[PDB]
Design an enzyme around this catalytic site. Sequence first.
Site, short mmCIF file in Angstrom:
data_model
loop_
_atom_site.label_atom_id
_atom_site.label_comp_id
_atom_site.label_asym_id
_atom_site.label_seq_id
_atom_site.Cartn_x
_atom_site.Cartn_y
_atom_site.Cartn_z
CG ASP A 11 -1.09 -3.49 2.06
OD1 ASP A 11 -0.52 -3.22 0.98
OD2 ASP A 11 -1.63 -2.62 2.78
CG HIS A 43 -0.29 0.23 2.51
ND1 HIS A 43 -0.32 1.45 3.15
CD2 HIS A 43 0.45 -0.59 3.30
CE1 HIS A 43 0.35 1.37 4.29
NE2 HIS A 43 0.83 0.14 4.40
CB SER A 58 3.92 1.45 6.23
OG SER A 58 2.65 1.85 6.70
#
EC number: 3.4.21.90
Lengths: 153, 153, 48
Positions: B52, B30, B104
């Site tokens: 993801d 993502h 992330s």
Amino acid sequence: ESDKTFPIMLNGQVNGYACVVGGRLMKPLHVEGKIDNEQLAAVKLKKASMYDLEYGDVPQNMKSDTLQYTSDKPPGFYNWHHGAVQYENGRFTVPRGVGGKGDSGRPILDNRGRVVAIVLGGANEGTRTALSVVTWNQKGVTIKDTPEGSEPW
Amino acid sequence: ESDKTFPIMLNGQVNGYACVVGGRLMKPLHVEGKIDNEQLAAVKLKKASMYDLEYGDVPQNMKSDTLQYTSDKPPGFYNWHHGAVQYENGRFTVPRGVGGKGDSGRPILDNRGRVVAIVLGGANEGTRTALSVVTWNQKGVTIKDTPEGSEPW
Amino acid sequence: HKVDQEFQAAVSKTSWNWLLALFGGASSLIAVGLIVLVCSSMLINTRR
């Protein structure tokens, strides 16, 4: 170590080594040349083209001086001709810039000196070279491994 | 420490991070941008959009520098980029509202110098910040953990 | 002619054979990918 293993000579130039384990004699197939032991040089060798390894049997007098190998193979540190060597996660490693061409067939020994792998070659990279080497299943069945991009020495 | 891990970059935001584990580059799917370690950008990724995440084999020239994952996940503290996280009730848990968006692809590491999981983004009920993360089964099954309503970081 | 070609029977069994054979196989895996998805997802739910 060098006390129970022998070099391979090509045109009198050393290009590899041969090792005797369990009285069985093993030699790297890609190392063109002759084992530097005339009492052994008369031996007749069978080969394993998938292993790039070939093998024979030593004379009955020297059966007592063979190495021995085991599959206990704990993880971590090991010793090599150039000193420290390491194994983990299914890979054997030694610092970059040692080994390489002309140095295959070298054995790897435990604290007890028992052999656990013999060098076929490897890939030279990063902090540690990725060694291509023959090894064994937990049950002691041989396995030859070649990390991506490894090359014979 | 984590310097063997690198930021993905876009617009000028260190909009995420990526890790070299098991010789594979790993980054959140993502998150898009330039991975700061430009050598990693030469890798062509393969995707696992349910997780993801995407991965690709890191080039051999530095693949031996890769981190390695763990099967171990007992409850307790694990070193993190924001100090540590408390693994409890089988879940990665963080104090309410610390760290966060921008992490992330940030790793979470075994004190022994191993990586236990990779974070995706957080959630928080109030007692603690709950982390959504990809982890590993005791037999090597990679499994994503994601508390309900977990936001992307 | 005392008859009109009902297209349902204008194809000979020997020819209709190929139609009814090839129209089946093309669909053979349309559900198998979802079946594998279900299997892997339930394996995860059994081990997660």
